[PDB]
Design a protein around this ligand. Structure first.
Ligand SMILES: *[C@@H]1O[C@H](CO)[C@@H](O[C@@H]2O[C@H](CO)[C@@H](O[C@@H]3O[C@H](CO)[C@@H](O)[C@H](O)[C@@H]3O)[C@H](O)[C@H]2NC(C)=O)[C@H](O)[C@H]1NC(C)=O
Ligand SMILES: *[C@@H]1O[C@H](CO)[C@@H](O[C@@H]2O[C@H](CO)[C@@H](O)[C@H](O)[C@H]2NC(C)=O)[C@H](O)[C@H]1NC(C)=O
Ligand SMILES: *[C@@H]1O[C@H](CO)[C@@H](O)[C@H](O)[C@H]1NC(C)=O
Ligand SMILES: *[C@@H]1O[C@H](CO)[C@@H](O)[C@H](O)[C@H]1NC(C)=O
Ligand SMILES: *[C@@H]1O[C@H](CO)[C@@H](O)[C@H](O)[C@H]1NC(C)=O
Ligand SMILES: *[C@@H]1O[C@H](CO)[C@@H](O)[C@H](O)[C@H]1NC(C)=O
Ligand SMILES: [Zn+2]
Lengths: 595, 194
């Protein structure tokens, strides 16, 4: 009896047990989410506890079989995926401390409350501070809200973070990973596949090179935004300096969407909205998903099951039942695919339906694989497929074919410039912020930043890379990066950069193979069957093959290249160079609002 | 007229499992084959070795009705020369077969919301099944170099799993009822004519 066949038998047992347990847990979770009562909460908690206990015992058993003496590659990948024990390696004393620290940080972040002048009320993060940051245009109010939310949370969160870092570093060291940063980067690692190999170290260099290529376009966009913001606050903004942190349209600066109203190039020209046509034609909730299914059939992807239409919640119930209206796509397992969404008759819900249908299509595509190999190729693959569908479903050509936009519609250069400007804000504002935050966390975990520079180095990197400067000086009492939800919830934050790059790589490859003539930002892959079969080659691999091979299949190269992203924004680059002739395209670290 | 005991198999109330399927021997009867049409969407009506174009006006010495319940995806393994787990370690049809396999969807009958664990199947056995063999023995399987001794711990596995059907599954996992009508004509008998 060779070890290989013993592992085969063990995995054959594990697949059958795990599939049923996972289906039961997912069904309980769906019932809770679409029916919010304490009884459903009890059922969900019990099912989750059962699944966790089973997975823990199976992971303990799987280690007995040595990873060596294995020949088949798929079995080796499955056993490696199952054998990862996570935080179990930590002792009894440290595990409880880590759980307590994580729960305390989550509760402190959730229990947000900053008082206001005149003792008017008490404002939480939502919806008080969020609305104030999103809508107010008063320097004093935004500065006060930003400072209060920063201090009231960071002062409490600072002591916990160092102990959390120490514990997580120890845990990573036990698992043979150098530190927590290496453990987080180990999600992009490929071994034993020549010419398809990747290393945890090379990811940093790839990200650095991609950002270095991105930087000029971001510089032009930042200079334009600074010039436009000069009007609102002439006294507070230097012409050739970094922008104030609290004036970026949101609490942290992750997105720049809310600054569109100030910085719309052509105010006279309106945007393309088809809500009125949908209302006039009595478009109901079902029609939108019907049209999304029609589009996916057009690309020659398969239809929707008959369990999707009967069991999904495609509209708010209307009864007393309380639901969470966050739109999600559910893959319960064993052939059950559903969508939960409180649909309204708007264009935004049209695009969201297309996105969720793309997620359901990916889930249906990779269903053939075993249980432990049913997911995106990497952590960033699953959302790019959703994003490209909403990219396609917004072009005026599609909305003219569907009958919403009138046939005599005429496209303006100005309207296209406005659309590209909004897209550029939303997509490009987050890239420097994401890269800088992940670089800072990697440096902190690696120990290259001493405990007395956690706030000097953070703002120094923000000045150098992002182009933003703090409004008021902060000592080591403050912990600015810990105010963000992801940092306080121990979530990886490097899946928002690779996703953005992969989305445009896919949307360039498919548009190329769909025989399209014209600018990339106006492309439609509907009524093209080559794109559907070029996409199905990647969507049906799951995790069976390395992500390098999966990427090469659709685009043609085994590397993350940011050339298509710049190709998408080619029309905007020329316009932003035209408008920024007089202004200075750059920022200098030295100047600071403190002086 | 010896009308066959059909309508006591196609219209039964409890089909058996696939590890111990149900075999009925039909002989000395008239076999009307227009009763099937009204039963259900009998989408699987494959016939191997004979011609199903209403050529059943011949005479056969024996008819064998083998009934069981399987998954939707596994009704393609009821065929000559197939491999899987409903063939290797379960009901296996010979390479040369002269019969008709009828499989139809019975979701409304055999699926309960909480689950239907009444049906079972076999996951592990030492060697593949010879055609038309049954193995109802339940001995602890051994994948290692240690005696089982009657306890299922490490490397010792109970042989038969459970299907556990539910109404919310996909069509690929819903329960399908399968009846196999094997025919047999020996050295010139004239027993069952239709
Ligand atoms: C994808 O496929 C075709 C275009 O290749 C579109 O389907 C049908 O295309 C025909 C073109 O001959 C059109 O039908 C015609 O519509 C007029 C009304 O304007 C009608 O009076 C004619 O009798 C004829 O049926 C039309 O575009 C379309 N059919 C219908 C009923 O709308 C399809 O729209 C394409 N999809 C996309 C997204 O481009
Ligand atoms: C939401 O959950 C409640 C229970 O938390 C459900 O109410 C019960 O439903 C069962 C049927 O499964 C009945 O037998 C009970 O009499 C109901 N009441 C109680 C107090 O248990 C409710 O049906 C769920 N909502 C929906 C739409 O099914
Ligand atoms: C691994 O096992 C699967 C099982 O079907 C087989 O298809 C595949 O060829 C095997 N690969 C290697 C490298 O042995
Ligand atoms: C759509 O708008 C037109 C405008 O003339 C109106 O006549 C028609 O009644 C509207 N249809 C609706 C509201 O369903
Ligand atoms: C449309 O693009 C710009 C933006 O308005 C404009 O200057 C240009 O003249 C227009 N294109 C042509 C071909 O006139
Ligand atoms: C099973 O019973 C139904 C009852 O209406 C009947 O229509 C059908 O023909 C029966 N199936 C047979 C006779 O195979
Ligand atoms: Zn999504």
């Amino acid at each position: 009896s060779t070890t290989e066949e013993q592992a085969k038998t063990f995995l054959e047992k594990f697949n059958h047990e795990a599939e049923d347990l996972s289906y039961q847990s997912s069904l309980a979770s769906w019932n809770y989410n679409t029916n919010i009562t304490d009884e459903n909460v009890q059922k969900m908690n019990e099912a989750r506890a059962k699944w966790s206990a089973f997975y823990e015992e199976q992971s303990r058993m799987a280690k007995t079989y040595s990873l060596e003496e294995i020949q088949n590659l798929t079995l080796k990948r499955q056993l490696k995926a199952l054998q990862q024990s996570g935080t179990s390696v930590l002792s009894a004393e440290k595990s409880k401390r880590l759980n307590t620290i994580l729960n305390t940080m989550s509760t402190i972040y959730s229990t947000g409350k900053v008082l206001d002048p005149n003792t008017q009320e008490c404002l939480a993060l939502e919806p008080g501070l969020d609305d104030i940051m999103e809508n107010s245009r008063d320097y004093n109010r935004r500065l006060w809200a930003w400072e209060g939310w920063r201090a009231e949370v960071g002062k409490q969160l600072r002591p916990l973070y160092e102990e959390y870092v120490v514990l997580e570093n120890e845990m990573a060291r036990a698992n043979n990973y150098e530190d927590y940063g290496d453990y987080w980067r180990g999600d992009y690692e490929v071994t034993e596949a020549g010419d398809y190999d990747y290393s945890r170290d090379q990811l940093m260099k790839d990200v650095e090179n991609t950002f270095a290529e991105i930087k000029p376009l971001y510089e032009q966009l930042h200079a334009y935004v600074r010039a436009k913001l000069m009007d609102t606050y002439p006294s507070y903004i230097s012409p050739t300096g970094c922008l104030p942190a609290h004036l970026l349209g949101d609490m942290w600066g992750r997105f720049w969407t809310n600054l569109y109203s100030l910085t719309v190039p052509f105010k006279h020209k309106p945007s393309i909205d088809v809500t009125e046509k949908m209302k006039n034609q009595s478009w109901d909730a079902e029609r939108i998903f019907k049209e999304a299914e029609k589009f996916f059939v057009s690309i020659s992807l398969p239809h929707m099951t008959q369990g999707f239409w009967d069991n999904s919640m495609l509209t708010e119930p209307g009864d007393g039942r309380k639901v969470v209206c966050h739109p999600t796509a559910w893959d319960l397992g064993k052939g059950d695919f559903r969508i939960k969404m409180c649909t309204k008759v708007t264009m935004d819900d049209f695009l969201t339906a297309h996105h969720e249908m793309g997620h359901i299509q990916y889930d249906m595509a990779y269903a053939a694989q075993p249980y432990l190999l049913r997911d995106g190729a990497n952590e960033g693959f699953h959302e790019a497929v959703g994003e490209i569908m909403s990219l396609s479903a917004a072009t005026p050509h599609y909305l003219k074919a569907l009958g919403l936009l009138e046939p005599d519609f005429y496209e303006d250069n100005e309207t296209e410039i406005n659309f590209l400007l909004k897209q550029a804000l939303t997509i490009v504002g987050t890239l420097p912020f994401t890269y800088m935050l992940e670089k800072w966390r990697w440096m902190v975990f690696k120990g290259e930043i001493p405990k007395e520079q956690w706030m000097e180095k953070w703002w120094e990197m923000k000045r150098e890379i992002v182009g933003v400067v703090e409004p008021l000086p902060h000592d080591e009492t403050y912990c600015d990066p810990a105010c963000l939800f992801h940092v306080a919830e121990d979530y990886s934050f490097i899946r928002y950069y690779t996703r953005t790059i992969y989305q445009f790589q896919f949307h360039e490859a498919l548009c190329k193979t769909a025989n399209h003539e014209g600018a990339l930002f106006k492309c439609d892959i509907s009524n093209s069957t080559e794109a559907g079969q070029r996409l199905l080659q990647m969507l049906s691999l799951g995790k069976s093959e390395p992500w390098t091979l999966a990427l090469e299949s659709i685009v043609g190269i085994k590397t993350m290249d940011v050339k298509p992203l710049l190709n998408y924004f080619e029309p905007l680059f020329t316009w932003l160079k035209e408008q920024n002739r007089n202004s200075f395209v750059g920022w200098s670290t030295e100047w600071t609002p403190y002086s | 007229t010896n009308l066959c005991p059909f309508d006591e198999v196609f219209n039964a109330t409890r089909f058996a499992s696939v590890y111990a399927w149900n075999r009925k021997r039909i002989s000395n009867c008239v076999a009307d084959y227009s009763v099937l049409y009204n039963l259900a969407p009998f989408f699987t009506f494959k016939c191997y070795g004979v011609s199903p174009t209403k050529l059943n006006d011949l005479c056969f010495t024996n008819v064998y009705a083998d009934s069981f319940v399987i998954r939707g995806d596994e009704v393609r393994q009821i065929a000559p020369g197939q491999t899987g787990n409903i063939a290797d370690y379960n009901y296996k049809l010979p390479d040369d077969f002269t019969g008709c396999v009828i499989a139809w969807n019975s979701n409304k009958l055999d699926s309960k919301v909480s689950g239907n664990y009444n049906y079972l199947y076999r996951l592990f056995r030492k060697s593949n099944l010879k055609p038309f063999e049954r193995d109802i023995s339940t001995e602890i399987y051994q994948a290692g170099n240690k005696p089982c001794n009657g306890v299922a711990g490490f490397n010792c596995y109970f042989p038969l799993r459970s299907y556990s059907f539910r109404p919310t599954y996909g069509v690929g996992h819903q329960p399908y009822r399968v009846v196999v009508l094997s025919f047999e004509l020996l050295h010139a008998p004239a027993t069952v004519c239709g």
